[PDB]
Amino acid sequence: DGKLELIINAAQKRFAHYGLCKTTMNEIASDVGMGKASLYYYFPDKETLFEAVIKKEQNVFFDEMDKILNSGIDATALLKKYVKLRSLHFRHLLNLSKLRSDFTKPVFAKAFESFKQKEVEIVAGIIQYGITTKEFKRGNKHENAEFLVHLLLGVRMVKLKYKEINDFDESDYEDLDKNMCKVAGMFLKEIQT
Amino acid sequence: DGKLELIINAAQKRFAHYGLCKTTMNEIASDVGMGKASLYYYFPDKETLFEAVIKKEQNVFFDEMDKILNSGIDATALLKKYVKLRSLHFRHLLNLSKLRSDFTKPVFAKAFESFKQKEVEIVAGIIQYGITTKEFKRGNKHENAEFLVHLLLGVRMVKLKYKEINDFDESDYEDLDKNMCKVAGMFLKEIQT
Helix, strand or coil, X not given: CCHHHHHHHXXXXXXXXHCCCCCCHHHHXXXXXXXXXXXXXXXXXXXXXXXXXXXXXXXXXXHHHHHHHCCCCCHHHHHHHHHHHHHHHHHHHHHHHXXXXXXXXXXXXXXXXXXXXXXXXXXXXXXXXHHHHCCCCCCCHHXXXXXXXXXXXXXXXXXXXXXXXXXXXXXXXXXXXXXXXXXXXXXXXXXXX | CCHXXXXXXXXXXXXXXXCCCCCCHHHHHHHHCCCHHHHHHHCCCHHXXXXXXXXHHHHHHHHHHHHHHCCCCCHHHHHHHHHHHHHHHHHHHHHHHCCCCCCCCHHHHHHHHHHHHHHHHHXXXXXXXXXXXXXXXXXXXXXXXXXXXXXXXXXXXXXXHHCCCCCCCCHHHHHHHHHHHHHHHHHHHCCCC
């Protein structure tokens, strides 16, 4: 019934620890206590399972966004809390993928672009609350929203190419994170009123 | 003596109008009034000639930077004039390349990284003048410098992948340019004093 969920979770951990390439369907089967024969009923390809895991992770972001958003702090505190959360998401994905996932197939072509659009929308919503709450000036909520989202994406993009799957330290994330704030911080002053 | 320079200029135009792939050594020879046999004395590969053209273009950026920098306007006016110039450079390169040049071989691996470092340095120098001129607070001139440079690079990176060699309009550059200011503008307020 929710064995799927078991298979997904198993998979998540494997990929988190070892990645996609070194990981094996015989392994994931072992983990859930099944047999490839059974696993293939749910997934007929390591890539498909990986996508499930990506999608689970994307949902976790939204769930946490919902928490922040229903926590009733101000427009600014939300925006910042978002940046942190967006940053940590990126971290999860790099830790599962370790490859050329971000730097890009047709499926992921779409999982990206939808997320990036959901994201712009979430942000437009915080801007909107700020506007009404009167913390932010109106403003094209939407233009700004995109800008912030793109600004953050650029931080992430410049930091890769820059580094490599292996050539990546723990200070490499402190960098991402610390930069994404700088940007967040500056964006806020472009609308603080 | 300076036939090289002729060959480079010929090449520049061809590539500007038609690109690298559709362009031909027999064509460039025609242009300068030579023969492949002679052209190959200067260049033994279309790629090599292309690099010369990239390097000529990179030098033109520096030459213009030198003009701006010896024009004695303030730290702010220079910084902005730089962003415009950096933007226009990017424009030149996309117009010569129309391919996966930016999105990346070993040679260009280096032409990029050196430029990006010369660039950080130029910028550190404007920051430094601002500091002494007392327009900008000190400040880690260097951290900031990088940040601005990376910020601009991100605008460029997000705008590609986003589009394609062909799927790129004239409004696509108005976008680049207009975004790179937004960023410039915001950066300035992070140090205006």
